[PDB]
Design a protein around this ligand. Structure first.
Ligand SMILES: Nc1ncnc2c1ncn2[C@@H]1O[C@H](COP(=O)(O)OP(=O)(O)NP(=O)(O)O)[C@@H](O)[C@H]1O
Ligand SMILES: Nc1ncnc2c1ncn2[C@@H]1O[C@H](COP(=O)(O)OP(=O)(O)NP(=O)(O)O)[C@@H](O)[C@H]1O
Lengths: 485, 482
């Protein structure tokens, strides 16, 4: 099985065996386009070749085409694209990170805020596709005509990847829940959101399950079946065998993303997202999500902005030089705050800077920030549902200290799996099931192995003192971009 | 022979001595660092070896030194005996060790203090540090009541070792917080409150007055020590800021700003009211604001987060940008004062996005130094028109800082050719007492200006940046309290 892990920064491809060991990798980046302050765009051509060119590294290290059982696909979510019947991108993709629609959304919020959330699960925000589409049909000349004329297909990244792969125009339930046009209850596009955002039905894909045969590849390109699809963060949940209500994973990447499987129960949170975990065997599993836009990206900024480190790994030793953060906090809201704050205007703050503050306090305040952002989500989840422990993946989870401190301020176990590329695993597992490469989810769930379990060993008083300083630091990051210009 | 004035610039991190002629040209320089506390003996021979360096560099005899002028880090409290032995290290002005000892004297008495002395009570000042010495230091109070002990700031010390005299001028005395600056003698009530016996207090004279003469056994001549003021108000004097409304800012580890207010005493709730100097039997008053961390914030970009090698580097980094792009840096390392008085405030950088680089920290740090000044200059504008800024200190080398400082203040910023103005200031005071210069009018004409930075910034832009600063300062408030 071959998994396509088309991320936000870098397109992965990976190949697994029924025991879930990797037999090939292939990763390539591609430019992150910023036409204007706060705007993030991807050229779908740069994305697409980076993807296939990266399949080949995983192929060429795996040692034959039709020896491939199926293809699974997982994508950076909400990122919005458009193309023609010959498969050509009609404009750049507007990444999930892009803020160009912050205020086209804002007006619409008040009259429609609770109706958008009630149908779709989503805090309305320029994060999700619906406003991204309305821009593309309102600003790209000829697109409405061409769509009212019937020549236009929209999709999120999975839907695009599945196209050049297959010829089919599909998406799963999980990626569709992310568009803020899909009614996660009724399980179909929601007509009065198609209205509100003025989006012609002639454009939307076909929502199908997450384990399904959508179609087969072009023989040029074996005839492999494309048989699995979920949103990037959703698959991580699958890859973690989070196949039960109550189970929680937390991906640490550019940003962190924390999901509680809920399968048949749909839960509501004012400050959190209700989306779809996956559709599987005529059953739709649900989830509650907290999406934190900037975590690991702060460690990056220590490397490329002020350049006080050369490698992200330098953080652990820089940070463990101190017994505590000595009152130094780093709220790294480079682009505003994700959940639960939903402050688009908050900007990144460092606070507590005496004459003795050195690189060590920076590095520590960054890793602490990552674990603090996570606990903000989890605390908010406990206002309705019990969170026992964190299965955990992503690049930053290499950091023995981060992982440790995460568990210490959470007073819960933090459990690092033996598998790393969990997001790909899940896209494999999904593609697997539908083409009996695996019998059941219970079989899959038994090859999931716990590589290390971080035990919380921190004082309750100490834990509350540090997180009270976190909250105060956050208060001071709020609303800064409507002050400064 | 042709003669010269010797200046004694006894800093806080360095003891300099410079030799001057009628044209303020510098013929010889010696400075030697010493190692909050300072050891008298250490600072003395660090200074003393720095005299000989300066005389050697000029190729001159003790015969040519027509007068000695003394400036010094002010406030710093010292105690000695009949021949000059320190009876405990110097409690330097930076010492926050009487801090809470003044907070409980603060409510009761503070308003009565500022009325008498000009000063909002603080650790900082001289009177608390010297009661500390009668209390704590082993059985000192018992001695100082026999007449056995002399007290003074750094200036009185030097002018004891040099001279045999037990003196100080008005300006240094105005900083003791024992000197009533309206009555111009030591104030009886401030002695009572802090438990000091006058058999301890130096005699206060003008800032331009032959106090005595050096021992031949030290310098080789019996030179007169004829000028004395606190190194801040001597930069003021060295800036030829002799008329009222004249202003100088010193950009160092902190900054200091003083306005000569001459024959009238001004009051401000968030500004110190002190003495510029006595001169020709005439006391001239001044208005001072202080910032504790200005250039020390640059010191931290290199010593702390270690993102520049030499402070020099800020210029090249900051001009890469043409705005702070919303990145600000309030370096409240130890707190805020004029006009926020929040000791619990701490340093913050805000505006960080994916692309905040060293350029924005460099540009934010220079803008801060510029903004903190404006804070003090605007507090003066609540009372008196501050027309323009004469400017000295290491940071004034940063040609960017200076143009920006002018830009946000919409005022000419003036860099003088002479750069060691604290030194030059004490020499004029010495030189004048010995007809080296005739009057200040001769010095005004002699003194001259190097570069003059001109405001060229939009009234719109100038206020959008500064509102950025204030809203930034709000979010540093009260951080150590919480
Ligand atoms: N040892 C470490 N300590 C701290 N942060 C780390 C460490 N290793 C990696 N990171 C951070 O983790 C990120 C890379 O994580 P990664 O698992 O590649 O997520 P990702 O590629 O952004 N997911 P995607 O959205 O699919 O592109 C960067 O922000 C790194 O700075
Ligand atoms: N070119 C520069 N640009 C910006 N900041 C500078 C520059 N040069 C020095 N600085 C900083 O500003 C101060 C330099 O002023 P300087 O007068 O050399 O300080 P100082 O020696 O502590 N003053 P003092 O003890 O009273 O004689 C230091 O704190 C430096 O960090």
């Amino acid at each position: 099985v071959l998994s396509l892990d088309e991320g936000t920064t870098s397109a992965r491809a990976i190949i697994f065996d029924r025991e879930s060991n990797i037999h090939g990798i292939g990763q390539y980046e591609f430019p992150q386009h910023y036409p204007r302050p706060g705007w993030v765009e991807h050229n779908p051509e740069e994305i697409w070749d980076a993807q296939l060119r990266a399949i080949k590294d995983a192929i060429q290290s795996a040692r034959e085409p039709n020896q491939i059982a199926a293809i699974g696909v997982t994508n950076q979510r909400e990122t919005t694209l458009v193309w023609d019947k010959d498969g050509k991108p009609l404009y750049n993709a507007i990444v999930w990170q892009c803020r160009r629609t912050a205020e086209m959304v804002e007006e619409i919020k008040r009259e429609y805020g609770t109706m958008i959330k009630e149908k779709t699960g989503l805090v309305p925000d320029a994060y999700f596709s619906a406003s991204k589409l309305k821009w593309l049909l309102d600003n790209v000349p000829g697109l409405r005509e061409k769509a009212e004329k019937g020549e236009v297909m929209f999709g999120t990244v999975d839907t695009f990847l599945i196209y050049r792969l297959t010829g089919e125009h599909v998406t799963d339930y999980s990626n569709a829940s992310r568009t803020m046009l899909f009614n996660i209850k009724k399980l179909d596009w929601d007509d009065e959101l198609l209205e509100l955002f003025d989006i012609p039905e002639s454009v939307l894909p076909e929502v199908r399950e997450s384990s399904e045969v959508y179609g087969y590849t072009k023989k040029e390109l074996a005839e492999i079946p494309v048989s699995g699809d979920a949103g990037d963060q959703q698959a991580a949940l699958f890859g973690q065998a989070a196949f039960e209500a109550g189970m929680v994973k937390a991906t640490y990447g550019t940003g962190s993303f924390i999901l509680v499987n809920t399968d048949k129960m749909v839960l509501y949170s004012d400050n959190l997202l209700t989306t779809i975990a996956w559709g599987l065997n005529g059953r739709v599993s649900y989830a509650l999500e907290g999406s934190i836009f900037v975590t690991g990206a702060a460690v990056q900024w220590l490397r490329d902005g002020i350049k006080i480190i050369k490698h992200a790994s330098e953080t652990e030793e820089l940070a463990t030089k101190l017994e505590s953060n000595e009152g130094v906090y780093f709220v790294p809201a480079f682009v505003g705050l994700g959940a639960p704050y939903w402050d688009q205007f908050a900007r990144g703050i460092i606070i507590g800077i005496t004459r003795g503050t050195g690189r060590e306090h920076l590095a520590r305040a960054t890793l602490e920030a990552i674990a603090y952002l996570t606990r903000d989500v989890v605390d908010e989840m406990e206002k309705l549902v019990q969170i026992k422990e964190l299965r955990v993946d992503g690049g930053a989870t290499a950091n023995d200290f981060l992982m440790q401190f995460q568990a210490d301020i959470l007073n819960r176990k933090v459990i690092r799996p033996v598998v790393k590329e969990t997001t790909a695993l899940g896209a494999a597992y999904l593609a697997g099931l539908a083409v009996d490469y695996w019998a059941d989810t219970r079989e899959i769930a038994e090859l999931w192995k716990a590589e290390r379990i971080f035990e919380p060993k921190m004082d309750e008083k100490t834990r509350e003192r540090l997180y009270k300083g976190w909250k105060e630091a956050v208060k001071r990051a709020m609303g800064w971009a409507k002050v400064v210009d």
